[PDB]
Amino acid sequence: AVDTAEQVYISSLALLKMLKHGRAGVPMEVMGLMLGEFVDDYTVRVIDVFAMPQSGTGVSVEAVDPVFQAKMLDMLKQTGRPEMVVGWYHSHPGFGCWLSGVDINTQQSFEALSERAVAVVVDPIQSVKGKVVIDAFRLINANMMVLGHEPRQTTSNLGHLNKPSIQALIHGLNRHYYSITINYRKNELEQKMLLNLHKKSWMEGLTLQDYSEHCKHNESVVKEMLELAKNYNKAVEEEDKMTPEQLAIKNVGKQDPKRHLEEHVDVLMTSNIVQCLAAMLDTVVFK
Amino acid sequence: LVFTQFWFWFPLSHFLSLAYTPTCVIGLNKDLKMPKVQYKSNCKPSTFAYPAPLEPEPNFQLLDNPARVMPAQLKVLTMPETCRYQPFKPLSIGGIIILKDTSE
Amino acid sequence: VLESTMVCVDNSEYMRNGDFLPTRLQAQQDAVNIVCHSKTRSNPENNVGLITLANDCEVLTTLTPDTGRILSKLHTVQPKGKITFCTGIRVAHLALKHRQGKNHKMRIIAFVGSPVEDNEKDLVKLAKRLKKEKVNVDIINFGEEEVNTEKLTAFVNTLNGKDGTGSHLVTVPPGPSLADALISSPILAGE
Structure with a gap:
């Protein structure tokens, strides 16, 4: 049975690509896939996120090119990231971090493929010049709900999850899908890089x-x-x-x-x- | 410390067994056994009694060699006027004390 | 078999020659066409890539199972400069390294009809490097039946060691198009 302390460490690269894609895609609920990896039973590492050329309708989106995606996968295996799919993300510009019905169906499919897949939601409208409005998710088994079982054993205090949002509760949080904790890990290069980003030149200095x-x-x-x-x-x-x-x-x-x-x-x-x-x-x- | 480190793993909270410090004083004799002798606290047996399970009041209390003796309720603790066994170590020290015995 | 084949082709100013009917460049075109067809008739997934050997030993097409692009690009070529070799072989080895299909066995074939201006000691050291890197080489020489045949024989012997039969030499004397030799050659006879 899954654990509460499960974490998702998303690469800074992945976060930047997610946010840029979504901000481009406002209002369209734009969608993209990400390559990560399931290191263990308590962690999921998200490496990179690449978008989808599809541009559907102002209320919905749709996969267009499975060939596009398969080719991307093969090539990134050749060079780039030899990871392989672990979930998918899509922006919800101004809604919170909840999963619509179609969202939940797409997930159901993802889990069917790989029981421990992940969904991800981002709000470029809401993500502020500071904290960033994002979250991860995985469905809740109706079999478990009817049988009285529970989503996750909380062998930690990492179950506060920072006050699950009222909007997420309303839209179905913890009754069909449950939040998961995101984190950012840097192997020091991107870290000191990030440091460099703002630093200015001695020209002006x-x-x-x-x-x-x-x-x-x-x-x-x-x-x-x-x-x-x-x-x-x-x-x-x-x-x-x-x-x-x-x-x-x-x-x-x-x-x-x-x-x-x-x-x-x-x-x-x-x-x-x-x-x-x-x-x-x-x-x-x-x- | 380990107990306090349970946020991330509940099973660690059992470590407080280590910190559990028997709040007792044992009078041991040369025969390495408990002698059937009593201790006395010159204090109210109302301020240091067991919590109520869910003479107005004297100033004396008595106990046996297996003696629940709290820290504050240790300084006042004393051996009665006379006994076969006498505290070879000052009782206000606390802990386990050896008892020098009289004739027999 | 799963085969990733790099092919180097000389285009030195000597390939302006025409000892082979109709002319040396057209003989090379014929050879590439026949080899590509043979590889295609082999396991279709087998992949191919092309390099031209000149003053700067350029690369034409990276790995691909196609042959139409191969032949098309190869058509737009003229003989110029002198073979630089060595660098060409190293580039081809790096090409084989960066191949998507790792399972595919790594095979280089070099059309090297020309005089080779190379040090045999470095030839031997490169042979060692390539054999340790587990890539098999087949040479197709035409023209300089004497200038470089001994050098290439030594190189092939180096690659083979005592059993490395994967290395192959095919030197053709003056004569018609470079088609009959290739078709009745060990490199494709084994196929």
Whole structure:
């Protein structure tokens, strides 16, 4: 009987391809296959995901070229990834992470082929500039439900699964399909790579910002500072006096003096200080 | 530590058997056996009695060589005024104590 | 048998020759056609690929069981430069290595009618490398019946060791198209 602690370690490559494909495919419930591997009874390793040329209808999608897929499989065996199918994924742009009826049927087929297949869902609409809305799934056996058996033995505390979503519950979560825990593992190369991605070049690292633009920038910032000081003086002219405590934040829903003052003073700190430092450092380092 | 490491495997939680520390004091004699002698706590037998299963109150309690003696309920524990067996080691120390015996 | 066959073909300026009727390039075309047909009549899945040997020893078609593309591409060729060999053989060996069908036995055949300007010591070392890499070679020589026949005999003996019959030599004297020899050759007679 399957275990609760089952994990799916998805390669960063796989995640990026999934998300890019789905974001391209919005709103179409675009679909793709992935090659991974079943290392053991507690883990599934997902390596790569490649899409499907099919472009069906604005409510549904369909497999077009089994020949396409078989050829991709053979060739990737030749070079690329000698993995072989472990599941499939499709975007649900703005629905959560639940499986429609057709989704469940496709799965049923996948499991019939390989009892431990996996389905995957991604929400490029919802996946934020930060956390990413994704999940994995495997069906629930109606035979087990009728017999009273249970999906997985939870020989762990890895069954919290971060508060299964109400939407997934509604659409059928844990009554026909159950979530699984995703993870990201890096063999240090992609890891330090990821680190490199944002890192910028010493070109700029030493490139002092032009100084005429900087002088004008300071001029503008000091002007807006003067005005913010005026309105701040007016605001403090009463502040607690005349007791806006009941007014609280609702004293005015606009134009807080202090917050703007601190924001702009901080930014002009940054600008002026670092530019002066770069000036000093260059003057002295190029000799 | 191992017990606390059960998140990822329940079967490990049994390890607290190791940490189980018998909260007892045994008076052992040279014959390497329990002598039928009693211990006394100069304290209320109400603050350190077994939990209720689901004289107003004296300040004395008595016990036998197999003696459930809690840490706080160990310092006050004492051997009665006189007995065949006397604590060769200070009883407030706790643990297993050897008992020097009188004539017989 | 499952066979992945690489074939190298010389196109040196000597292949401008015409000692073989109608001309050397057309004799090579005939040889490739007959060999491709023989391989096709062999296990169809058997795969084929092509290399031209010149100043830069270029490659024409990677592995494929087809022969139409083989012959078509081979048609668009003219003799130029001088055979560089060595590099050609190494490229062909790498080709056989990067073959999709690993089960297929690895077989190289080289049309090498020309004078070979090679060091026999390095020929022998390459023979060692290739035999240890488990690939069998068959040479089809025409023209220089004296300049390089001894060198190729030594190379083939090296490849064979004491029992490596998979290595084969076929040197043809001046005469008609290079068809009758190939058809009645051991390399295809065994087939």
